[PDB]
Structure formats: C-alpha cells, structure tokens
Design goal:
The chain has 228 residues and is α/β, with parallel strands linked by helices. The protein has 2 domains: 1-90 and 185-228, Periplasmic binding protein-like II (D-Maltodextrin-Binding Protein, domain 2); 91-184, Periplasmic binding protein-like II (D-Maltodextrin-Binding Protein, domain 2), CATH 3.40.190.10. The radius of gyration is 18 Å and the shape is globular. The strands form 2 sheets. Strands 5-1-6-11-7-10-8-9 form an 8-stranded mixed sheet, sandwiched between helices. A 3-stranded antiparallel sheet has the order 2-3-4. The protein has helices at 30-41, 56-61, 75-78, 121-127, 141-149, 160-169, 196-212, 214-221, and strands at 7-12, 14-15, 19-21, 27-28, 46-51, 67-72, 81-97, 114-117, 135-138, 155-159, 175-192. The two termini are 34 Å apart. Bound molecules: sodium ion. Sodium ion (NA) is lined by residues 78, 82, 193. This is histidine kinase. The PDB classes it as transferase. Keywords: Kinase, Phosphoprotein, Transferase.
Length: 228
C-alpha cells in the first residue's frame, strides 16, 4: 500500500566497493548489503536502480527513485535533500604514477593537470579554489584513475577506498596514493527534501543494524570501509 509501496533505491552503477552493478549484472556492494539489511528489518520492499552518477541527484528530486543509499553530505546538498545520519566516512586521496613527483597536499596540485569525479564533493571543493582550469572531469572515479595511469593527466583525486579497489580491479599497478586521509566525508542515505517518513524509516533501520551488530558484520566484509 503506502508502507508496502516498493521503495526505489538509486545509486551509482560504478562506485565499488560501496555500490556497483557486478559482472553478473547484479546490484552489489556495501551500500546494497546495508540497504537490503535495512529493508529486511523495516519490512520494506526495495528495487535497486543503479545508474550514472551525474543523474542520480536529479532522479531523487525528480522522484524517479525514492532514495540514494550512498551520498556524501554538504551544505549545498542539504539545501535540497535530507540526509540520514551517515553509515560511513569517506576519505579522499591524491593518486599519482609511481615515477611521478609526489605531492603532500592538494595545494601542491595548483598548476598541475588533475582528474576527478564529475561533480563529486572534490570537484565542487577544488573549483571553489581556482583549480577548475587545471582539471579534467570524468564520469567515474575509475575513469579518472585510468587517465592518470595512461599518463593522460598529472594527478587524480578520488575517494581512497574506491581508489584502491579500482587499482586492483582494473590493474592500474603504476598508481599509488600519495596524499592520503585528506578531506573526510559523511556518507549515507538521502531522500527528497521534506520526506521525513522515508527519512525516519531508513534512519531507524540504520540505528537498528548498529545496535544488533549486523552493521559491523556487514562492514567487516568490505576491508577498509570505516565507520563514523
Ligand atoms: Na535538509
């Protein structure tokens, strides 16, 4: 009916290990497992619709999906959607080819060519700092890392964990994370502004998973995934 009305879950089709469509064409990842677990304790029915990230924010407001299982919090962002508490903290890192000159911080990236996720927290963050001219935008963080690997740019800034997972999966073995633990993010579910029902439905499920131990059980599965 209303509570039995299938909840449609949006997410990025290419953001491992948090969320991604796997080789078998199946929704997979930490977020997915978390969402399925929540659906189970809250008695919800969910449909996963993972897609290009450049349109999931829209689709939330557009109502094409009812919630996003994995999105980083930000002021500009809170002004249009409501976030539940976060289920994880996402650190970023600066990646470079091994040979290349190391950088100890993102200020050292001024004047250098830099790849990064199209409109992710770091895109916005480095734009607001005059980097925009010296930076290439990619559909996925992995595309950013491929360009770096291919000597197609000088550095890349992407979420640490996905970075490592991507380096392994796509065999970008000339890449190393040089500048680590910089710019931590609060990552979690989010629903359309003023949808306190759904919002509370998810927050409660998350809170429940944390008190029963299922949350940590799921998190321990995905190495490197941190908790708030
Ligand atoms: Na809000």
């Amino acid at each position: 009916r209303d509570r039995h009305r299938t909840i449609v879950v949006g997410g990025d089709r290419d953001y491992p290990p948090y969320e991604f469509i796997d080789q078998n064409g199946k929704p997979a990842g930490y977020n997915v497992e978390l969402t399925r677990a929540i659906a189970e304790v809250m008695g919800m029915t969910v449909e996963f619709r993972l897609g290009a990230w450049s349109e999931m924010f829209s689709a939330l407001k557009s109502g094409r999906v009812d919630v996003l299982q994995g999105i980083s919090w930000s002021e500009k962002r809170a002004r249009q959607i409501d976030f539940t508490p976060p289920h994880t903290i996402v650190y970023h890192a600066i990646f470079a080819r091994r040979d290349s000159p190391p950088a100890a911080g993102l200020e050292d990236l001024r004047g250098r060519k830099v790849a990064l996720h199209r409109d992710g927290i770091m895109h916005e963050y480095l734009a607001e700092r005059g980097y925009g001219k010296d930076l290439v935008l990619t559909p996925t963080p992995a595309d950013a890392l491929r360009l770096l690997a291919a000597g197609g740019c000088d550095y890349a800034v992407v979420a640490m964990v996905p970075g490592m997972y991507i380096i392994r999966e796509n065999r970008l073995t000339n890449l190393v994370p040089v500048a680590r633990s910089i710019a931590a993010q609060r990552y979690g579910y989010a629903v359309r502004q003023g949808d306190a029902e759904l919002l509370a439905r998810f927050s409660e499920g998350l809170a429940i998973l944390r008190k029963t131990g299922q949350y940590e059980a799921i998190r321990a599965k995905w190495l490197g995934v941190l908790e708030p």
